[PDB]
């Protein structure tokens, strides 16, 4: 419990899968570039999930065109329309910062099943 839970529960949303760090996930982010609202899919590994309630954010890392890109989102962000967990990951810790220094095939992640 938190003193501001009665404020946070209003903004807390459903439709958030039980993703965990190490799970490969694609987040559908609404982008309103040029007055047009479209959906851009950021597919990558959840390397972090910190916070609680409304203020909880999760970090998704993906390698793109030779550059590793971490993109952090608030878990209950209204700008995310859907987070789809593609495959679960069998990581051994809560945060996968070590994936920043890893590249190529060494950036593999074990899958639970």
């Amino acid at each position: 419990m938190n003193t501001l839970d009665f404020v946070d529960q209003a903004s807390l949303r459903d439709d958030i899968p039980t993703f965990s760090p190490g799970d490969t996930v694609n987040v559908h982010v609404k982008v309103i570039e040029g007055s047009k609202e479209r959906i851009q899919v950021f597919k990558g590994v959840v390397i972090r999930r910190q916070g609680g309630g409304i203020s909880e954010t999760f970090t998704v890392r993906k390698e793109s065109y030779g550059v590793g890109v971490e993109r952090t989102f608030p878990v209950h962000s209204p700008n995310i329309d859907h987070i789809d967990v593609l495959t679960r990951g069998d990581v051994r810790r809560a945060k996968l910062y070590y994936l920043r220094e890893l590249r190529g095939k060494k950036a593999k992640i074990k899958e639970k099943r």
């Binding site: 946070d8 903004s11 962000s77 700008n79």
Partner: peptide
């Protein structure tokens, strides 16, 4: 009471 974050109409 405290501090937190909400989201606007523009997200």
């Amino acid at each position: 009471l405290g501090m937190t974050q909400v989201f606007d109409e523009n997200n």
